[PDB]
Amino acid sequence: ISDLFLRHFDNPILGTLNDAARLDLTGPLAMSTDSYTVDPIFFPGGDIGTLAVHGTVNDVSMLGARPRYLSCGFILEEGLDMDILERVVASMGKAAREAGVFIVTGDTKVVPRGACDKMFINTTGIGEILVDPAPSGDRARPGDAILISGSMGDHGLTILSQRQGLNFAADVCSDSASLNRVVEKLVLEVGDIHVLRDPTRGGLATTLNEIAGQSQAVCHVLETAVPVRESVRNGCSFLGLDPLYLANEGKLICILPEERAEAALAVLREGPHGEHAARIGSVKSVGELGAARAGQVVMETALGGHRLLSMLEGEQLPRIC
Amino acid sequence: ISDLFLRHFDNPILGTLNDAARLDLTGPLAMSTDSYTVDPIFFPGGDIGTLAVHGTVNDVSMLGARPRYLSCGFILEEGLDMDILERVVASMGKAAREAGVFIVTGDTKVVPRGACDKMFINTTGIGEILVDPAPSGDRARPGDAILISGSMGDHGLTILSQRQGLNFAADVCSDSASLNRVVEKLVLEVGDIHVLRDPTRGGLATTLNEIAGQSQAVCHVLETAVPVRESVRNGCSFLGLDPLYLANEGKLICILPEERAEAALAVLREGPHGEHAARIGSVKSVGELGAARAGQVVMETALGGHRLLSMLEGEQLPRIC
């Protein structure tokens, strides 16, 4: 019934329509999976289709890999508006085409009404790893710079504020974008990249916590150097949110030796949402500050003090992606 | 919060806990994805965990491939019974271990109550293709035997009959099982395998239709040679169902040249549910019968006549897998 798929995704790997798709790929590969439950489904600056491609493209690249192939799996609600599914799949085609990535295989389940809320999408990405060693949450080390690709809090703020009918500044919108090309350039052109990660789940603070944890170092962050859009700042205090824990869908943390840091910003500025790319701190070894412990993230505040950025709260906030 | 995952799946590829998992795989690969919405979640002979591993292992093998890695993505309902999630993940570990397959990466989304019905699972499998050329729905050709791995209708009948509190024969239960080892042996030991496929969506008739369609041949089936358990026969007429269109979760259609057919049954008999493995017909070229058209499936009935097995009806029957 629903075959807008070839009308938006078409390629000879998908259009062979077997139980599995055949892939030609070299050796060491990166694999990643995500499900997408964002509510609502259309919002300023993107949609579930948009997240579904972009976020999985990103997850694959975080291993310093070139994403080549996506697979994808819809769970749709009975009597769901077909125009909606049409728009979402069109979002996906464009995003895939835009990122150089082919959706090669899929599935589609339909469920009675009530059983699911309109639709959900899982996508699974596969790509080829470009370097040895490759970026990894446990490879942050004493003397590395911590860089951010762009502003924090945008995505989370915009769907939290849509879901309450509030509009705020017109310039508050999702940052859903593919960062494969930036990563590709980082790893092959700047080199010796230690950690790549995108602050999606629980925002910058908590992914900084996972890195600090995995590497057994501390992360040092400078509040002022963390770019946050003024309207996102204002949106966040109106609704009582910390933008450093809000989800981002189009951003990346990059952590590498000091020597290569300035060159990695160059690239990052030319990346999506890269106007605001910045060095936000450094990685220091246990007790180097000190007192601050291994697994801990400490921010020098704007006011000349300190703040421990602690892990979530806070099971989550629901359905932001 | 939910980390029974390492308590049931644990391996160093998953237990590195990055945005993506690193995989070491050779060249030509098979990839497949499925979402699992079966209702109810526990039934005689398997569960959603069970389908989730087994059915994706199967889908990958249908390309004559060795499945190596699964990724997996839960969508769970808020306040869902943790014992349930515990049982389902334990099902998955066992099934993965049992099939020689590692769950290497995952995701987990939680949604408010109402937004989804208890839980859903997508899994995506990846494996290495064992032969050139490889089995493919368009490779059925004049003079091939059509073989079945086992009895038809079992899975569909059992969850349709659970969902109505009915019990029927104790020997009616899901056939959820991994058929990677059978396939592996078929392709490397019997050889020149033309088509592999598992009659899941809409049962044997409709997957026979997809093959007949893709190959541009007719499929000839012999009703009596199609194994159906007596209690499944009786369960099916009580509830007004055609067992040849009921979903199967542990079965496979194998289509190959006549010369290798007897040797492929040997293997098939030693396969799961292989007691009943049988030759059910042959593949004939347009007009060879004739009148019967390309894309068509014609059965010689038990009573000495003919029946055209037509494509579904019949959007589906909901949530059988």
Q: How far apart are the first and last CA of chain B?
A: 27
User: Where does CATH 3.90.650.10 sit in chain A?
Assistant: 135-321
Measured torsion, CA atoms of residues B287, B291, B297, B303, in degrees rounded to the nearest 10? -120
- Bridge pairing between strands A195-197 and A119-129: unpaired
Q: Which residues on chain B are in Cβ contact (under 8 Å) with A117?
A: 111, 114-116
CB A110 within 8 A of CB A79: no
User: Where does CATH 3.30.1330.10 sit in chain B?
Assistant: 1-134
- Beta strands in A16-93, from DSSP E residues, in sequence order: 21-24, 28-36, 42-43, 46-47, 65-77
- Burial of A102 by CB count in 10 Å (0-12 exposed, 13-18 middle, 19+ buried)? buried
d(CA B59, CA A14): 15
Say yes or no for a CB contact (<8 Å) between B32 and A19. Answer: yes
d(CA B185, CA B277): 15
Among the listed residues A196, A64, A214, the one whose alpha carbon sits nearest the alpha carbon of residue A138 = A214
Breaks in chain A (C to N over 2.5 Å), named by the residue before each, are: none
CB B71 within 8 A of CB A33: yes
Q: How distant is the alpha carbon of residue A114 from its chain centre?
A: 30
Among the listed residues B126, B149, B72, B130, the one whose alpha carbon sits nearest the alpha carbon of residue A20 = B126
d(CA A16, CA B308): 25
Say yes or no for a CB contact (<8 Å) between B17 and A111. Answer: no
Among the listed residues A280, A278, A287, the one whose alpha carbon sits nearest the alpha carbon of residue A218 = A287
- Minimum Cα–Cα distance from A124: chain B residue: B124
d(CA B123, CA B108): 12
This structure's resolution (angstroms)?
A: 2.6
B106 is in an annotated binding site: yes
Taking CA atoms, A153 is separated from A236, A244, A265, A284, in Å, by 8, 6, 20, 25
Say yes or no for a CB contact (<8 Å) between B35 and A60. Answer: no
A201 is in an annotated binding site: yes
DSSP state letters, B15-67: TT--SSEEEE--SEEEEEEEEE--SSSEETTEEHHHHHHHHHHHHHHTTTEEE
- Bridge pairing between strands A65-77 and A42-43: unpaired
d(CA B293, CA B56): 33
CB B96 within 8 A of CB B9: yes
Six token digits for residue A284: 């220091």
Q: Which residues on chain A are in Cβ contact (under 8 Å) with B20?
A: 30-32, 59-60, 62-63, 65, 125
Phi and psi at residue A231, to the nearest 5°:
-60, -25
Say yes or no for a CB contact (<8 Å) between B65 and A16. Answer: no
SS3 of residue A206 by DSSP: helix
CB B116 within 8 A of CB A119: no
d(CA A129, CA A146): 22
What does the DSSP 8-state code read for residue B108?
E
Among the listed residues A138, A140, A150, A191, the one whose alpha carbon sits nearest the alpha carbon of residue A174 = A150
d(CA A165, CA B39): 35
d(CA A272, CA A251): 8
CB B129 within 8 A of CB B30: yes
Instruction: Give the helix/strand (H/E) hosting A249.
Output: none
Instruction: Give the helix/strand (H/E) hosting B143.
Output: none
SS3 of residue B213 by DSSP: helix
User: What CATH number should be reported for the domain whose range is B1-134?
Assistant: 3.30.1330.10
Looking at residue A168, its amino acid is F
d(CA A319, CA A114): 17
CB B20 within 8 A of CB A59: yes
What does the DSSP 8-state code read for residue A62?
T
Looking at residue B6, its amino acid is L
CB B71 within 8 A of CB B21: yes
Six token digits for residue B264: 């492929």
User: What CATH number should be reported for the domain whose range is B135-321?
Assistant: 3.90.650.10
Six token digits for residue B153: 């209708």
d(CA A125, CA A64): 13
Cα angle: A184, vertex A185, A187; to 5 degrees: 70
d(CA B244, CA B306): 15
Other residues' Cβ atoms within 10 Å of the Cβ of residue A259: 10
